[model samples]
Target: STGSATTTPIDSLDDAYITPVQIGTPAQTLNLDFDTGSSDLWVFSSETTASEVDGQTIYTPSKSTTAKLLSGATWSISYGDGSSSSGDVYTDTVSVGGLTVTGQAVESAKKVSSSFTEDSTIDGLLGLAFSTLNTVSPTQQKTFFDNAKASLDSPVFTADLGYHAPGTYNFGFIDTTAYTGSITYTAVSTKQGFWEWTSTGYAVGSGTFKSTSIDGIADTGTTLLYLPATVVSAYWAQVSGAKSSSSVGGYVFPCSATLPSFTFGVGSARIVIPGDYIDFGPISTGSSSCFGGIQSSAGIGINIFGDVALKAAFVVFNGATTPTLGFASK
Candidate 1:
């Protein structure tokens, strides 16, 4: 039911490409993207067109001695960013960070886009976020956690990013020795896959905005911090000479004044967003000031506390014990 495996970056890999892992008895290897956005492990297959599969590492079932298909089951997923792909269901032994779980449900992509197809280093995606978004069926259900839970020394899993460097995300048993004390655990909700919290109010430097309160969710998949229009306007008001520029993405600012540190009241807990992060300049080639780190997502309908915020805290996903999430000091 359990085994061990190791992760090594594929040479000449691109940023858009996903990481690959060695799986099963004969040492079958497959590329995957460790996505926090959703929980589903899928791969590209032979049936996929060569054009659609260009640059992506495709799985050859004939090479695996234990590979088995799930008959006629198929799956297709579309992300909030408009990226979509489809594939068939299959079962295999998958591994990560020296932990291998058998009977893992994986999807073999039959169709993909040029953006995904052009990535020669990436083969598929290994979703480690949550089981609620899993594309697998209940009867044939299986997740990386479910497969490798017993082998993991601890019942909890921690994601270490800062020390690992940018794009160097690690997933495995939660190593408590790396932190200060016990982590603060929260129960999972059926409405969303990631942790959701209510923002009581915002504080700039020492000044607190009692009337400007909002509610939103924390997502690791997003790269920038998203806020409601009212909250965004109020927060920007504190910045001197900060004008709403539409030249960029309507989210950046241009000013010489020092920005103040703001904190979001999450019930009894206080989540802090540094001032420097609020001043995201133009990331693209264009010299535009509309690249503010914090933006208003009026149509998106949710405030995403993405990597910009997660980098400041230690997050633990305790799937082995229960469907719960824990936060602690990094």
Candidate 2:
């Protein structure tokens, strides 16, 4: 069997993409962020504190006949952005697109950080990364993809993110029509429990495509693109008024700056990110200075090919006996 879901950016900046997921016996649907960077399917639930609840929808397990508490189990996670959530566990009927998992572990959040509450667009997160990254204790749980892969026609899923447009996530089968040219596949190292892959090289606009090894994770959960300082510097240097600002967090530039396109090599395939997407958006409401979508991954150990880069290409997370990543131009 195969499953498919539409990926929609929550706002104009394309800050995050979300899809509707059904949970529990009654099939309560909630808009969730299908994150490929982590492994833990957690949701805002009836157990969440009132203080943590905002305008977001909550998944009430008690109403679901299939809901079963995973006795003595608990889970907690902290994201790079400082947002955190911790909760008890519950196994319930979970479905995405048309795929169904009868005994899917669903973390019912009891606490959540301000960032989550502030962003009401997402009801919770549905992790699509490897189950090895699952934070559950006593007994770790499998991710939706991990549990469903065995039944799928193919052990693969593809991510297609668009610039201010709706994308799609297709499981089991690749949507050949979604992309042009051919898919360029690269071996993946899942030792770190991420969709980790190495880029052959990169180029600033039509400049030279430097042949260098850039190890990075394809993180759909992350909002922006983060690369090495040297590579990012070259990109920022092309824009007239671009500079890294501690006050604004990363690189910021005049809204009118003429940004250059960014190209990265996937094996021999070169995927180009148009300059318009790099402009990002204004720092503040009505501000003239805009934040850059591509920033330096200096202090942050691993470089991340987040939504900014993913939006420009069609990516495949192939979980075969030997995992591999596939990239194609769309």
Candidate 3:
């Protein structure tokens, strides 16, 4: 096992952070979204009909001597947001930054929905969730992080996402220079293939911390923060003219409305997400309305602290014997 750390520079899209991924022996590199919500390493590939691929970089196995087809192995995935993809599987050498994980399962898409096919920037997804959620069968596959853990200095990774600016995903070692103050660590439950934790309380703006526990998963794949419907209502209530806009599909606020800061209580610690981060962006061409980045996940069964909420903090995904998360302000 190798004890080394590699820093992968991530590009911040409006709602996502993507890092470079190298596949096969000679390395067919592509930019992939790092998603903690799912466990599958899939990419656009030759199997994907040309018409189905907008401008994605596809992996052509024949060009890489290290790529091996896994006979009869197939995969399919559908997201809560309606994006879906399906394909065959291959065993290949996958590398991120400078760390390589041999024999990683690579799902090559044969079919993709318009939601994905039309996205010209995203080439694929790198699932960081536990291997239990892998879609490949007859044997489940291990994620790159899990496969590479034994070779790392520590069984951990970090997400330093940003708002429209370059961010980073570090492997093996933590970069203390990236954050300030002491990190607040919280226990996480991985039974559901997610990093789930419960906050001690929450507050809107400069208000007192409401001593109500809020449970959620720290997911990188999701674009926005999702709270319970009641909590969602409470946050938006502070903004004038803020209401669910069926036309825009989410809670919209007057473009000039005064938005307040939001805070979450961890184990004796507070994580504050700024009001600026709360307002995602304009809903449409006109300047009259803007969409709230935080919304309701009442029916989804799990609240997600997505990029919108995560960008404000430096996060550590600890995979040691006891799974946990360490958070510090950036």
Model 3 global lDDT (CA atoms, 0 to 1): 0.85
Task: Name the best candidate (by TM-score).
Answer: 2
The local distance difference test score of each candidate is: 0.61, 0.94, 0.85
**Evaluation by lDDT, superior candidate among 1 and 2:** 2
Pairs that collide, model 2? none
Tens-place lDDT digits, model 1, residues 31-118? 6666566777777777777778766556776677777888777777776666778877777777665566677887777887666676
Across 1-330, the per-residue lDDT of candidate 2 in tens digits comes to 999999899998899999999999889999999999999999999999999999999999999999999999999999878899999999999988999988999999999999999999999999988899999999999999999999999999999998999999898999999999999999899989999999999999889999999999999999999999999999999999899999999999998888899999999999999999887888999999999999999988899999999999999999999999999999
Model 3 TM-score, all chains together: 0.95
lDDT of candidate 1 at residue 314, scale 0 to 100: 68
Off by over 4 Å in 3: 1-13
**Sequence-dependent TM-score of model 1:** 0.77
Clash number for every model? 8, 0, 0
The per-prediction CA RMSD against the true structure, in angstroms, equals 4.4, 0.7, 2.1
Query: What's the true lDDT of residue 153 in model 3?
Result: 89
The total of clashing pairs for model 2 equals 0
lDDT (Cα, 0-100) at 117 in candidate 3? 84
Candidate achieving higher lDDT, 2 or 3 = 2
Off by over 4 Å in 1: 1-20, 24-31, 118-122, 136-140, 163-172, 180-182, 197-201, 209-215, 239-248, 255-262, 276-283, 286-290, 320-322
